[PDB]
Amino acid sequence: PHDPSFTPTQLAARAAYLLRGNDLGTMTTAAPLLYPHMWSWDAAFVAIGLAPLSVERAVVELDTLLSAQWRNGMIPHIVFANGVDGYFPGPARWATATLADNAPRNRLTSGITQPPVHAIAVQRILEHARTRGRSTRAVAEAFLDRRWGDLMRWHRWLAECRDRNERGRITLYHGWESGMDNSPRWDSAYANVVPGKLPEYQRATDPSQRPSDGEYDRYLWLLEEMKAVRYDDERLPSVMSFQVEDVFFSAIFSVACQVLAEIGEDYKRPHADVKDLYLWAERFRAGVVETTDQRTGAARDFDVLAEKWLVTETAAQFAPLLCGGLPHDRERALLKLLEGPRFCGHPDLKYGLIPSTSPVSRDFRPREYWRGPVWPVLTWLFSWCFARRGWAERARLLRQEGLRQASDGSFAAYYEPFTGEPLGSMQQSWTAAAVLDWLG
Template identity: 35%
Template structure:
């Protein structure tokens, strides 16, 4: 149901000063440091998450660059031999009962799925902040591993054969319960009781009406079990796997990562040309395959059926981060973001889903709330394409939310209330980056 019938009412310039927010954000990142990595949250997410680590390290670059590099090194130490970087690296000091599905479910010390490849972007951001010899050593260690990550997504995950990587689970997108996946998930056969013998931990520490539903979770476990029981093999995906989707945000980050790798390659003595060529090919494939000129947005595509999701979700705006996105697509995405569906023209942070949709939900995870990480990506995209005033407005909107409510996991797009986990690491980290760019 659409519970946002009027313009949002959250205050525009409230709360903490820049210095107070900077101290609070740095304190949160320090408190969430767990031996060799930063956890997203001490309550809900007690392990290391992949794309969280990328965003967190970008913020740490401003206050603790050694920890920024360590976060990436910790994550990539868990990289699989085939190049995949797991979406969770489990902390052996955390009890199995404190997070589901944990290592016993996956049968190994990491999950077998991935998340958006934002890590090369993070590595380049850390290095350019402080390009000293220590940072150069870290880049040299990371570069071949970042290349292997990209090779895995290129060589093993192009199930559709058009140059885009397919995700094999909604969790791989980072936008777990986005309406982008609804049509594909509806076709996933769910056993009578797929959660039998399991107990969701997220609903014990977070509000039930903020989290994915039990039916969502039943499908998540069905899909994850199919991939696990198939030995995490990608060669047989087209023949047997129930969820294969080309996500515009995932692939846009893959393209942006190639451009970051081109910058890194030039510094470490490798050839950047191949990375630039790959980025251009990804941008072309995204434009040809996922862009809808009628909506001015990119839409997720079900590889098995060939159908595009009709849902207008924030992942359809993220390709704006690509600098070689054609002018027509740039104009379309900016117009969509500025429309009443997303509210950028009103000086608002962008919600995760079309606020005019009948099933928009301002509280339930990726079905309406505002998330800082995707808004941060849009902010970068706007600046990349010369929309400087719009970028400045979006920066202000993000910081106003955080000043007023605190460093929450996500925010009610109507009231500005912080929801989800408090003291959330990537919100704190990206606040530091936004403050540094003032």
């Protein structure tokens, strides 16, 4: 009635209740009905949410994902659950099991990748484990013995196969790989995707957050282009109608390289690996900074086919705040943009949180996935990265507004920015995980 919010203990309990309800055994669904499989960067957040509940089970989540890693190091963005068909495109449509030389042998997966937040999840598991007993430390340390090499091959695949020209930015061949499927970031690149003869498909709820058929036809056509060259890394530059450098993905990778490097020093991993990681951390920091607006510090994506900077007003333009590297004066301008009336300081926002697209941008749509709504997962990543920059009060304020928004217990993936209405899929594992990590 008068107050529908949960207390912190009720909220923590309900978040943990959801995470365990979404557990199929050794993988956690991204969401029970919409996304009934393991998604890659969701699984990293799930591992973060499991760490305060069970270090052993958090480690199992990353083990399951890394058992689906391709032979070339790519972590695919979906690991399908042995039995479920309530999602399209499914294993039959990707056909990676038959076409992809590098596909894993006892897992069904997609053929594209997703942001490398995984090292951040490894850090959170290790921080939790060190506060628990010796036996919990041993569990976390055995995971590192077993999976350090796999984590290196993941970072190396990105550094070498998605940055072939050592520009320090990650090339994507599908908007799905950015994690922000329908971000205005990718509109002009998608306008240059022309579907050919497209195999007959079905569907993949509220229309104001319902794909868009023309948009979805383009998503599926990129799959056809990859399948035609059997997912061969070497051929994709020649055939893909979509080739972008993702500056937000690149900044995340810079941070992840630095985090994994620090892990490798703390746990006496090979010196040559730690050196490679610090090298990539700096290269991708510099590649992010090279994209930035000279007055505001805002980061731009790059259309590799058109050879054009992509100027849009989304949360991705704050990529440099995550990895650092801007000159002092430009970073102050960028923080001013973040806090001002185009983003967190917009007067109609219910919470002091980062909308996915600026409310004043012409591309803004308050209900439409990444075109405006506030995503707890982005709140979490900015808060954690800000605390790492030393901006304790900034990170605290994001956490506090994030908890206030989450306190209805809907665990929605994203929220209407002006009304706070929970939108889209409820029961989203990574929102439960963000809440659990914040509540401590």
